[model samples]
Target: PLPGRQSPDHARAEAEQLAWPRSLGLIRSDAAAERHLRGGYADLASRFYPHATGADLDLGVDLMSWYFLFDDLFDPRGENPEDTKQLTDQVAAALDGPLPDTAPPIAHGFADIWRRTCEGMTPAWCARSARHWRNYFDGYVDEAESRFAQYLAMRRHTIGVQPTVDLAERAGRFEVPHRVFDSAVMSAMLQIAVDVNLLLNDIASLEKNMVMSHMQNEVRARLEQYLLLESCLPKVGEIYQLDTAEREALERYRTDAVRTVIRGSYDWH
Candidate 1:
């Protein structure tokens, strides 16, 4: 099992901090949403539960925290945008100044090796990440489509067969001020809202997780090559006239290159 947060700190100083509302946003029908709240707790008590079947709402509260930490560690988010690599000139000058001219092609040969390494290490992070079939995100997107199916079912039931259930009596008494609706019907609609919210969230999560996780890893791996580039410049200069000052200049560029940027773009609410 994953480690739990040991803090007894205030998580819900407000009623709005509840996870259920977020959970409610995932369900589509009022019946399912209410059933979830009623049943989510009830199942914990009674030890009997049904599979949501199509519901997919999830708060990325945990995942977000992790991704942020990863960003803090790696991503540079400062106001400085203009990168002037004066160090490459220094290294170049140093290289030009030093050692006699039997000038070996240091940059070309070294860069070729690095490029080959990267070319072989393509973007194949996980077998599942590359797959489009039977994927988690696809499953949730399918759930969102299920909303149309349920709507069709309700249309058929309303015009075709009214299977009388006792919940129908409870439905009559259930009322909210200003909105006069049959309790069962109201519940069903709310459930759809809850389901779709979750479905969309899950779709976003799995999709973002799959793409970003791979891209993040790849970029991180590739990032080190830039470091290797700066470090190797000193060696390249060794064959020519590269000095410590020149290497430091190259380091500036290596640190700030944003060849790949990974950020979450979609909205959850």
Candidate 2:
């Protein structure tokens, strides 16, 4: 939750209720069975984008669901870099084309996000989203390398937040120009925002890391968040001029997105 924000609106309740059947429809019975039993999709969709409505709400559930299910597929099967790359590359190819029947059912779920996300957006947006998603898929490949290398720096710079921000923009139906999001200032804010989330993830996954054979779960958390506010945000303020409401909404989106990472990691465990 955001600082003083305590109560959820009625829309959240509605989305949570819908997320159940949606999840079941999207994945294997056993997968959806565990998730639905815990209200996994509902809580995730509700918390991640607290402001979304209608199709946006539904797409958010589907997209996040896609990641969780995909990660499930990747984590168990990815034993080495080459193996991970081969697995994910095939999935990447499936993104632009039909999901082969032999492909894991998760491909169909991502294909769902690809279709809905691209509906009113652009071919360019579609291309950009596909790129970021491929980057994320490749993260599994890269992660295989990191397990034997500098896990921290590799994660900070490489696995950042392009995928999350890409999906967030599409979910909100905000057709923000490439120049706006593509700017260095914008990228820095997104990177910082993702760092906070990933740091929180590292914190919670400490035990899991021990089993996975890795170290470095963020030595300092609060400091990076403070630096983001002081250095990155002010630059955004100076760069983008807008009315108060639009600015506040954009700011809220940024802050809330970071919070979602934190809260989602915490909530998941």
Candidate 3:
């Protein structure tokens, strides 16, 4: 088993301070949010993005809050398809135009987050960030398109860290030039990171997916999982410019970051 990185006292304390239910509103209440914070959502975010700080930390926390709430909105026993379509449509429109007067609290919250994410970046950064989100929401739409052949694993490609990576660069204000972003190495790292996150998620969620009748492409998914640590993670280290010793250290750090997902997900199960 991979080792655990102890959560910072401050990250846990500060994450506890976020009033996600009140701030985001509507779907869940303060009581529910309190239960979640106590239930490890905040701690999970802190662990997932331990290196984040300042507004980056804020972005990480807010994204976690939003994502969990979004997940609840689609639990198999919860909202009907029509309600989901309506809710997603409202949020999608909010993403495009100015926030509507009659939007739901969740839509309002997403609009605020969406703005902050796109606010202080170059046009290239802004465009890329927006595109990732578009793809994520499109995944939601795709899921609705088919209930019978529910390959929820496909969603990991569309809705998982693919967007989170874009968001992470924006949140950290780490803008890579188009050349770097377009580089084959960077592309490979992102895909591997996504696969690592998702495959472990598949492992953890296997029982639940079975209960919910969710189908996955396990052979191919395992193939993606197999490459993450040995092959692709090492390749990620080469994307940076550093001396021999420093490069090796950062390589280990990046490797830990990926394994942390597997370890974290494993333990979370």
Candidate 4:
């Protein structure tokens, strides 16, 4: 009812009329069912191919955990143009021949980046402080930011990786198929949510301890940035259960090992 706010009357009507059923009916359709079946099979297939090619199975796992496309909107993208397709291309290029027996190393790389940032925010030489166990919040933010970058790389890499699914033909990685495509988006969103949990609920402790006390606006500033970052994320957890259910899917993908040297393929048929 406020002057600047859009009328809730229209919003309520739209929700009750179109948005709700369209979304719910979407998930209930045969199309949705086929995607589920194909996605699972393809995910398994892609997992197999990468292993043969010597791509790191661990990297594939990382990809599965971060993909999300359930909330896709029409953008009329070109048939996978270079600008849109670059992300998958880069990911494919990074893997060397013969997948490693173990996953290519992933440093819980967030730790050091977080440690340094938290240290600078404090004066107590508490960068290494056990009290700042809550620093995991920033670690979450770090993962969200960095993983997003990596997601782009993987998209670019797909160009070299999928002969049939070249960027010029599809415009973006979504053209690849629901299996690898959905999993990547889901996984990334889940990671971002975990990071969000840290930022939203835990960071306040730091503020309370006078850790950011002198920097009076630090908490508020970070919170605003945190919220802004969250807005850029998809609200897909409920639709796809990005974190909870998606993890179960990851386990299914994780089980199969390729040749002794290669990692698992993403398993998208």
Candidate maximizing lDDT: 2
Residue-by-residue lDDT tens digits, candidate 2, 155-224: 6534435665566666566644455457676665566565666666666667662223122334144435
Q: Could you tell me the TM-score of candidate 3?
A: 0.71
For candidate 4, write residues 94-197 as lDDT tens digits. Answer: 22122223321121222222232233323332322222232322222332343333432322222112211111111110121124324544334333323332
Q: How many clashes show up in model 1? A: 26
Q: How high is each candidate's TM-score?
A: 0.17, 0.73, 0.71, 0.19
In candidate 4, stretches whose alpha carbon ends up further than 4 angstroms from where it belongs are 1-28, 41-76, 80-156, 159-263, 266-269
Q: Rate the local accuracy (lDDT) of all candidates.
A: 0.25, 0.59, 0.58, 0.28
RMSD of each: 29.9, 4.6, 5.1, 24.0
Error of 2 at 112 (Å): 1.0
| Candidate with better lDDT, 3 vs 4 | 3
Residue-wise C-alpha lDDT for candidate 1, range 13-50, written one tens digit per residue: 12122343333232346664454443222211111101
* Candidate 2 least-lDDT 10 residues: 210-219
Q: Return the lDDT, model 1, position 16.
A: 21
**Which lDDT value does model 4 have at 252?**
28
- Candidate 2 overall lDDT versus native: 0.59
